[PDB]
Design an enzyme around this catalytic site. Structure first.
Site, mmCIF file in Angstrom:
data_model
loop_
_atom_site.group_PDB
_atom_site.id
_atom_site.type_symbol
_atom_site.label_atom_id
_atom_site.label_comp_id
_atom_site.label_asym_id
_atom_site.label_seq_id
_atom_site.Cartn_x
_atom_site.Cartn_y
_atom_site.Cartn_z
ATOM 1 N N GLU A 166 50.880 -37.002 12.972
ATOM 2 C CA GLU A 166 52.136 -36.879 14.244
ATOM 3 C C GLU A 166 53.047 -35.700 13.929
ATOM 4 O OE1 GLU A 166 54.879 -39.813 14.675
ATOM 5 O OE2 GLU A 166 54.684 -39.970 16.821
ATOM 6 N N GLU A 206 58.270 -44.131 28.419
ATOM 7 C CA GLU A 206 56.961 -43.567 27.737
ATOM 8 C C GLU A 206 55.943 -44.259 28.152
ATOM 9 O OE1 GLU A 206 57.308 -42.978 23.510
ATOM 10 O OE2 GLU A 206 55.279 -42.965 23.121
ATOM 11 N N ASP A 236 51.091 -13.105 44.458
ATOM 12 C CA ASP A 236 52.274 -12.324 43.881
ATOM 13 C C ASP A 236 52.800 -12.481 42.802
ATOM 14 O OD1 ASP A 236 54.409 -10.395 43.417
ATOM 15 O OD2 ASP A 236 55.866 -11.688 45.052
ATOM 16 N N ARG A 242 59.611 -42.370 10.724
ATOM 17 C CA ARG A 242 60.000 -41.777 12.015
ATOM 18 C C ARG A 242 61.300 -40.768 11.972
ATOM 19 N NH1 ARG A 242 56.793 -45.966 14.322
ATOM 20 N NH2 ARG A 242 56.145 -45.370 16.168
ATOM 21 N N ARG A 254 56.088 -34.500 15.176
ATOM 22 C CA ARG A 254 57.246 -35.074 15.833
ATOM 23 C C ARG A 254 58.427 -34.013 16.413
ATOM 24 N NH1 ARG A 254 57.473 -40.803 15.768
ATOM 25 N NH2 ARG A 254 59.944 -40.679 16.140
ATOM 26 N N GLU A 256 61.672 -46.809 26.658
ATOM 27 C CA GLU A 256 62.087 -46.214 25.304
ATOM 28 C C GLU A 256 63.368 -46.389 24.880
ATOM 29 O OE1 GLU A 256 61.925 -44.471 22.581
ATOM 30 O OE2 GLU A 256 59.654 -44.444 22.395
ATOM 31 N N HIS A 287 55.752 -35.810 20.797
ATOM 32 C CA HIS A 287 55.013 -36.099 19.565
ATOM 33 C C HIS A 287 53.515 -35.760 19.927
ATOM 34 C CE1 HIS A 287 58.090 -39.729 18.889
ATOM 35 N NE2 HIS A 287 58.624 -38.470 18.781
ATOM 36 N N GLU A 324 52.866 -37.759 23.359
ATOM 37 C CA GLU A 324 53.545 -38.908 23.867
ATOM 38 C C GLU A 324 55.083 -37.891 24.537
ATOM 39 O OE1 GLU A 324 54.571 -41.802 20.599
ATOM 40 O OE2 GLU A 324 53.445 -40.067 19.565
ATOM 41 N N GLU A 370 57.846 -38.349 26.379
ATOM 42 C CA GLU A 370 58.945 -39.141 26.948
ATOM 43 C C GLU A 370 59.790 -38.404 28.043
ATOM 44 O OE1 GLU A 370 60.809 -39.512 22.858
ATOM 45 O OE2 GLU A 370 60.072 -41.488 22.377
HETATM 46 C C1 LIG Z 1 47.983 -41.487 22.799
HETATM 47 C C2 LIG Z 1 48.254 -41.580 21.302
HETATM 48 C C3 LIG Z 1 49.269 -40.248 21.200
HETATM 49 C C4 LIG Z 1 49.200 -42.789 20.976
HETATM 50 C C5 LIG Z 1 47.136 -41.333 20.353
HETATM 51 N N1 LIG Z 1 46.205 -42.326 20.196
HETATM 52 C C6 LIG Z 1 44.969 -41.755 19.231
HETATM 53 C C7 LIG Z 1 44.055 -42.663 18.623
HETATM 54 C C8 LIG Z 1 44.460 -43.785 18.356
HETATM 55 N N2 LIG Z 1 43.596 -44.506 17.780
HETATM 56 C C9 LIG Z 1 42.284 -44.326 17.792
HETATM 57 C C10 LIG Z 1 41.032 -44.899 17.139
HETATM 58 C C11 LIG Z 1 40.129 -44.686 17.146
HETATM 59 C C12 LIG Z 1 39.547 -43.288 17.418
HETATM 60 C C13 LIG Z 1 40.892 -42.534 18.116
HETATM 61 C C14 LIG Z 1 41.923 -43.021 17.952
HETATM 62 C C15 LIG Z 1 42.890 -42.039 18.751
HETATM 63 C C16 LIG Z 1 45.630 -40.376 19.125
HETATM 64 C C17 LIG Z 1 44.899 -39.276 18.470
HETATM 65 C C18 LIG Z 1 45.034 -37.900 18.698
HETATM 66 C C19 LIG Z 1 44.547 -36.927 18.176
HETATM 67 N N3 LIG Z 1 43.389 -37.239 17.360
HETATM 68 C C20 LIG Z 1 43.085 -38.620 16.881
HETATM 69 C C21 LIG Z 1 43.632 -39.767 17.650
HETATM 70 N N4 LIG Z 1 46.893 -40.243 19.809
HETATM 71 C C1 LIG Z 2 60.831 -44.878 19.088
HETATM 72 S S1 LIG Z 2 60.172 -43.111 18.986
HETATM 73 O O1 LIG Z 2 60.172 -43.041 17.337
HETATM 74 C C2 LIG Z 2 61.279 -42.283 19.573
HETATM 75 C C3 LIG Z 2 61.391 -40.763 19.387
HETATM 76 C C4 LIG Z 2 62.505 -39.965 19.827
HETATM 77 N N1 LIG Z 2 62.793 -39.993 21.644
HETATM 78 C C5 LIG Z 2 62.221 -38.361 19.888
HETATM 79 O O2 LIG Z 2 61.168 -37.915 19.471
HETATM 80 O O3 LIG Z 2 63.151 -37.733 19.932
HETATM 81 N N2 LIG Z 2 58.916 -42.755 19.287
HETATM 82 P P1 LIG Z 2 57.567 -43.248 19.182
HETATM 83 O O4 LIG Z 2 56.901 -43.791 20.662
HETATM 84 O O5 LIG Z 2 56.533 -42.306 18.487
HETATM 85 O O6 LIG Z 2 57.607 -44.545 18.300
HETATM 86 MG MG LIG Z 3 55.158 -41.231 18.472
HETATM 87 MG MG LIG Z 4 55.036 -43.243 21.105
HETATM 88 MG MG LIG Z 5 58.338 -42.786 21.751
#
Ligand SMILES: CC(C)(C)c1nc(-c2cnc3ccccc3c2)c(-c2ccncc2)[nH]1
Ligand SMILES: C[S@](=O)(CC[C@H](N)C(=O)O)=NP(=O)(O)O
Ligand SMILES: [Mg+2]
Ligand SMILES: [Mg+2]
Ligand SMILES: [Mg+2]
Ligand SMILES: CC(C)(C)c1nc(-c2cnc3ccccc3c2)c(-c2ccncc2)[nH]1
Ligand SMILES: CC(C)(C)c1nc(-c2cnc3ccccc3c2)c(-c2ccncc2)[nH]1
Ligand SMILES: C[S@](=O)(CC[C@H](N)C(=O)O)=NP(=O)(O)O
Ligand SMILES: C[S@](=O)(CC[C@H](N)C(=O)O)=NP(=O)(O)O
Ligand SMILES: C[S@](=O)(CC[C@H](N)C(=O)O)=NP(=O)(O)O
Ligand SMILES: [Cl-]
Ligand SMILES: [Cl-]
Ligand SMILES: [Cl-]
Ligand SMILES: [Cl-]
Ligand SMILES: [Mg+2]
Ligand SMILES: [Mg+2]
Ligand SMILES: [Mg+2]
Ligand SMILES: [Mg+2]
Ligand SMILES: [Mg+2]
Ligand SMILES: [Mg+2]
Ligand SMILES: [Mg+2]
Lengths: 475, 475, 475, 243
Positions: free
Chosen positions: B363, B224, B51, B344, B365, B216, B273, B130, B132
């Site tokens: 990133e 997280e 529905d 940050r 944020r 966190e 993020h 991420e 949270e």
């Molecule tokens: C899980 C998170 C958010 C911490 C994350 N780790 C990664 C991450 C961290 N380190 C890396 C090292 C090598 C290759 C890929 C990687 C990805 C990435 C990411 C996202 C999009 N494009 C590239 C990377 N995001």
């Molecule tokens: C420690 S924090 O900087 C905190 C982020 C916050 N809660 C916010 O984005 O509102 N996050 P990260 O895990 O990205 O270091």
């Molecule tokens: Mg982060």
């Molecule tokens: Mg983080």
């Molecule tokens: Mg965090």
């Protein structure tokens, strides 16, 4: 009235204390007490000191000392204090130059009346006000890291029809007031008759000239009392004293009054409708038998000013966050900027008064009691006068229920502002009509803008609303 | 993965029920259950009905019937249901034409990935999120004519240091978490170690590839957990499943989780993020050793898109009223539209990842978990791609604590929007970048604007805030 | 131990998670968890990221990203987590240069050990610590505008002898501990025998080499457990792990432990006595049969350093406001800067150890557990070394009960500092002995001073003490 | 003397009027944290032969040399004077910024953030006076008033010049400018130590005698300072329970 008139009154009334009163910027009366023995010529010649840094919108700490000089016109006996007390309003003055203070609300009203005379348009602006209020039994509220609440309560509130007993444990005897149903069934449905009589008597005994009192639309004790209109300053003084009397009459009788615009959700808010007219040399200027709703060109242009300046004017007429909870459709408050005769859904209503030219006036329905009548009244006059000066033509009257308008027709009319931050932003951008003749000065306007942003707008914005938890806890 | 792979999994896992899942417009997953016996080829060939008029942002009552077709990629065993259950996500289709639904969030993701390919700019958009969340003990709230409240509670909340006993009557043993102090002291100060381990295990057992879990910043159980990034659609599917697993792991262990942006006032909000990168033919496009923070022209222009389209983009990335309670200074969330490495306090941070080109990413944020990841991720990509296409140059990075900028300097930088109504108004005015390639359609955008106004913005606006009582009861 | 040793341990022990630990500036261990699958060579080669801006005494928000690199020596299985977990301590490094962080406490200890070697004075500093603690049943506390409180409770507390029932409603069975009478009657007077056995066992199973456990002097569950001494860094790591084990063993058994210096007024505080000795080439340096208390010149000069630098040294050995509530006479803690053999009233005691040169050491009784053992141990070494280098002669030992000195004699001996603000002021003024060899750097010292002033000293100073109400309500 | 007698009687009347009406009054300096403390501001002036001595139309804030030197005495002797004007541990919880009490030793007209305010009184020479804002009601008005006079008189006698007035919100001074102005003492033990070290201005004419001063120092140490010092503060538990 003279200084000697006041001394005679104090002597005749066997006064023990004189209560020295003045108004802060936001709109709350301030006071301190001096003994009768200290009430002498010196008070009129030298004045009295106070801490301008503890008063909102006044002075900084390093420039704290301010001066007060009495206004003999305002002397009234206090109806509440067991020790016989005389209340007097004062003007705030610079302690060095003895000049009137640019941020004394009472001075603004003074300047407004003088400016009017100086334009030649009229010599007197008459204000008739209707300050509605709620007679509650209790209130509590708080704001913490992990939660927040409020609750208002009233024996006659419809939310209590299912209560096993009253707050004191006595039986529930019904006759509570239905939402939107308080206007105005006879007792026992009206549970506040004797209390409102006590309010009416206290007003009469403080020299008010009374016109009516009644229960208002809202459940849980909404009320209205009307007293005779007066010129701008006197009317603002009247308003302040009225709120004091209403609040304290309630207090002494186990109740608690609020003049806030919208304490109840889904029931009527409380307005401060302002009936306005201009007079010159003892003759009325608002009436013209050939005009729509019997209105003259001067009147029409005054309305034109009000409606045109509304987006910034409401910063003084609707000066709180809560104000904007009232400006919603269905509760006899305005939601757009139109005038219309007989129309309680309009922003400016023209009451039906027949052919008597003295009775012709406009009712500006937008204002509420949540601020400063000295500023509010003055701001309305400035908007109205700018309208006259510039011959501003209001858009055609709309003689319809403006809450029921289909969405397409409703868009082709300017809406009332949604929230306080909008009117503050707008006031900041455009306020020249208020600075005419130096009635409002830039320092007053800046302080106002600044105060509202830091103390009201922002503190509300940063705090999660309970309904967000209803909406979003499970996202 | 094929239909036959799913049937094999069902057979091998001795599945009793198949949970048919899909996403509503706002971002809550919907489901119904069919028995194993009813899970056959017909499900893949004909699909299943539901529905559409009971689902938010979908159909009207007279056009109610809608169709679902399965996505074999999304089949996972449910970790919670005592009767062995296979979960599968579906795509919403028109029941007559069998065309994909223009308001199926999963379809928007699909269309986004295809559009990317068609531009030639890249062939894959990787999203690392991420999400949270808070692990609370309890929550209650209401909204009535004469009052309203909310309360969240948590054993580790600093507000409870003074409690005589715990909620169950057992003694107060201290080790509660200070506001802004949850990141990240060892147990017993961290009271959720074992619970988060259960969450991690459940995620692992549902085929997530785990990276970390931790407490966190926020008091009262903020947490997280991170899992491996993936391409847009898969990442959005992962997000929805993750929320389901987190919420239900908590539920089964006597707790209650919220992903709302800001359940606590004066402590950290919860963000989502989004780490983002573009790839073509198996090679990364974000890295250039000579650019600021190691960023290529493509990367820089992507950020340019994000920051340029922010005033409308946030309608999908920050889609609730509560969202805007998080975008305030002091809590590691953005308050203006700048990018900066290591920072940050910024809207786009560039994490420090060294010279490895595969690890370079931005990133973003700003976003939170309060809406729809399918739409949010897609919207970010469309903004990012418009930036690349138009070579939009972001304003210079500001490598400073952005909450502590001198007045003149701060005012030179575009701020984040103040409230949801602002981003909705802006989305309505300007959204062409989203309609490129038909990824978002006008009907999706209009429904979104309409939904938010009628169901979120207005309902909050009309209800008095408890803090207004603190401010105004005594006016 | 090598990276490959740790991988073998993880594999052999069927570890599910790795808990990544490091130390914040004040002295609380921090942690996050990664799955076993994510624990690989990359963790040793590249390290892991965290948010340095959420860790006390670390980074600002715009320079947040920091890096961690493992210390294989520190790998232990966690005795508490139901999911098998391997704990490992990390060093904090700059994410750009990969240099050790100047404000990583573990780095300071590292640097201290290297500096010792570089002086040629010795090659090893051995630390034996006694971290006393209280096993409480409950604790609560708060701080508000109109009042404030704390309460600790314990079944064995003397304040409970007159309780009608225990907290759970069961009967009062007496055998509670008298103030100053916990050291150390047999059960049932000692109510914590089994719990301390569990603490001992959990320590043994984490590779600690145990020496003794007992009830301490304080009523309401004071305790002491001793493990084998070790070199500086290892000893500091041992201390941190010991606290974690003590606190969580208690937690898992329905109790709550505090290592605060003085939670009970009018009963013994909790110290962290540090037994210290220097060794070179496997031979002890402290012993000389002809010296007072068998002490060599090197030993005597080390004491001279401790007692001379005390007015600044205590900023690291006694780093909290509560520390100074313990440094009061009558409770086996120091009140002045003297050394004496066999003397539990002295600042440095020389324990009676006979003629074995390997057993000779000084016991620095001043320090407590309220701070950071890495910094405390290091600071003591730096003071001790400066003493040796400058041949600082301690004032003659006083072999008397120092709480009972005649007023004239007392006044002639330097007192221990009165309050934290005094030692912070003194540290700020004079700290060159700490900066030798760059062991402590100016940025560490400045951050420490700044942290203590803003987060501890000032917040206590501005809050009225409850005893002020006893003293002054009726002025 | 009359003023000190008036003060004592006033406290008695305030406290017992409250008591008889079901309330309870405290004159303690700081019973509420995060809200204003209670001061005992002392407006002071010297007269000779029925004529006022404080006024000079040409002086800053209309102040004569005699007045200015009196202020110089108060601000100069402050580090010991407060042992009588601010004689309790609680006193020092009021001397914190943001609540219209002093945090440093400056005078300024119209200035409620200052240690000595000169109230705006116009050209009437009889009304000119200094307001010493430091003192509170937590001690002994006979001793407090007397101590202020002795400090003020020593200032006149030695022509002690106060440092230039600072006509600014003193809680809002830039760090560099703040650090250059002498602060009010932090705690009671500081002013008691200072009183013990330097108190000659009080012993002039034998107004205060050594036995009074010694008893005062001794009393405050043994009955107030020490008993507070040895007792753990509740906020220490907030700070340190989990160390
Ligand atoms: C899980 C998170 C958010 C911490 C994350 N780790 C990664 C991450 C961290 N380190 C890396 C090292 C090598 C290759 C890929 C990687 C990805 C990435 C990411 C996202 C999009 N494009 C590239 C990377 N995001
Ligand atoms: C420690 S924090 O900087 C905190 C982020 C916050 N809660 C916010 O984005 O509102 N996050 P990260 O895990 O990205 O270091
Ligand atoms: Mg982060
Ligand atoms: Mg983080
Ligand atoms: Mg965090
Ligand atoms: C009290 C209130 C608001 C009901 C009111 N009555 C009046 C009122 C009503 N009837 C009148 C009849 C005759 C003369 C004056 C009158 C005033 C007016 C008013 C206000 C300003 N200018 C003119 C009138 N306002
Ligand atoms: C555990 C504690 C504090 C009781 C302790 N025992 C010892 C201790 C006791 N007896 C010993 C006998 C022989 C050799 C070493 C010894 C160490 C030491 C210590 C510390 C530093 N340097 C030397 C000794 N510390
Ligand atoms: C009955 S009402 O129309 C109700 C007014 C409503 N309380 C408001 O102005 O918000 N007032 P009135 O008829 O007294 O002008
Ligand atoms: C019995 S005691 O002397 C007591 C020490 C006290 N708790 C202190 O504050 O140092 N300790 P130990 O003999 O174990 O060194
Ligand atoms: C308004 S105040 O400035 C406040 C004084 C504050 N209670 C104090 O601690 O001195 N006092 P006053 O203006 O009456 O001298
Ligand atoms: Cl607003
Ligand atoms: Cl909004
Ligand atoms: Cl201190
Ligand atoms: Cl003190
Ligand atoms: Mg009316
Ligand atoms: Mg009405
Ligand atoms: Mg009306
Ligand atoms: Mg011991
Ligand atoms: Mg011991
Ligand atoms: Mg010992
Ligand atoms: Mg005063």
């Amino acid at each position: 009235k003279t200084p000697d008139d006041v001394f005679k009154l104090a002597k005749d009334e066997k006064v023990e204390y004189v209560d020295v009163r003045f108004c802060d910027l936001p709109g709350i009366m301030q006071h301190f007490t001096i003994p009768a023995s200290a009430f002498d010529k010196s008070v009129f010649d030298d004045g009295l000191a106070f801490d301008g840094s503890s008063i909102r919108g006044f002075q900084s700490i390093h420039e704290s000392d301010m001066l007060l000089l009495p206004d003999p016109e305002t002397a009234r006996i206090d109806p509440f204090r067991a020790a016989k007390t005389l209340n007097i309003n004062f003007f705030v003055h610079d302690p060095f130059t003895l000049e009137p203070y640019s941020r004394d609300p009472r001075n603004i009203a003074r300047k407004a009346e003088n400016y009017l005379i100086s334009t030649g348009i009229a010599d007197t602006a008459y204000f008739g006000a209707e300050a509605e209020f709620y007679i509650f039994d209790s209130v509590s509220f708080d704001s913490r890291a992990n939660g927040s609440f409020y609750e208002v309560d009233a024996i006659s509130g419809w939310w209590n029809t299912g209560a096993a007993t009253e707050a004191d444990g006595s039986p529930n005897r019904g006759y509570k007031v239905r939402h939107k149903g308080g206007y105005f069934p006879v007792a026992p449905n009206d549970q506040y008759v004797d209390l409102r009589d006590k309010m009416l008597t206290n007003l009469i005994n403080s020299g008010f000239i009374l016109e009516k009192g009644h229960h208002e639309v809202g459940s849980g004790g909404q009320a209205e009392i009307n007293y005779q209109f007066n010129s701008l300053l006197h009317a603002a003084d009247d308003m302040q004293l009225y709120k004091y009397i209403i609040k304290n009459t309630a207090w002494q009788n186990g109740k608690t009054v609020t003049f806030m615009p919208k304490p109840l959700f889904g029931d009527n808010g409380s307005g401060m409708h302002c009936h306005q007219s201009l007079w010159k040399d003892g003759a009325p200027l608002m009436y013209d038998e050939t005009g729509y709703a019997g209105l003259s060109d001067t009147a029409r242009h005054y309305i034109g000013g009000l409606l045109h300046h509304a987006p910034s004017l409401l910063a003084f007429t609707n000066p709180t966050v809560n104000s904007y909870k009232r400006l919603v459709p269905g509760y006899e408050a305005p939601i757009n900027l139109v005038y219309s005769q007989r129309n309680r859904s309009a922003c400016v209503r023209i009451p039906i008064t027949g052919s008597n030219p003295k009775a012709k006036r406009l009712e500006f329905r937008s204002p509420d009691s949540s601020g400063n009548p000295y500023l509010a009244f003055s701001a309305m006059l400035m908007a109205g006068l700018d309208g006259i000066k510039n011959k501003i033509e209001p858009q055609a009257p709309v003689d319809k229920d403006l809450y029921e308008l289909p969405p397409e027709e409703a868009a082709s009319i300017p809406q009332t502002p949604t929230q306080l931050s909008d009117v503050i932003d707008r006031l900041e951008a455009d306020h020249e009509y208020l600075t005419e003749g130096g009635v409002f000065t830039n320092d007053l306007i800046e302080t106002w803008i600044s105060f509202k942003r830091e103390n009201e707008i922002e503190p509300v914005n940063i705090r999660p609303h309970p309904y967000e938890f209803a909406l979003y806890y499970d996202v």
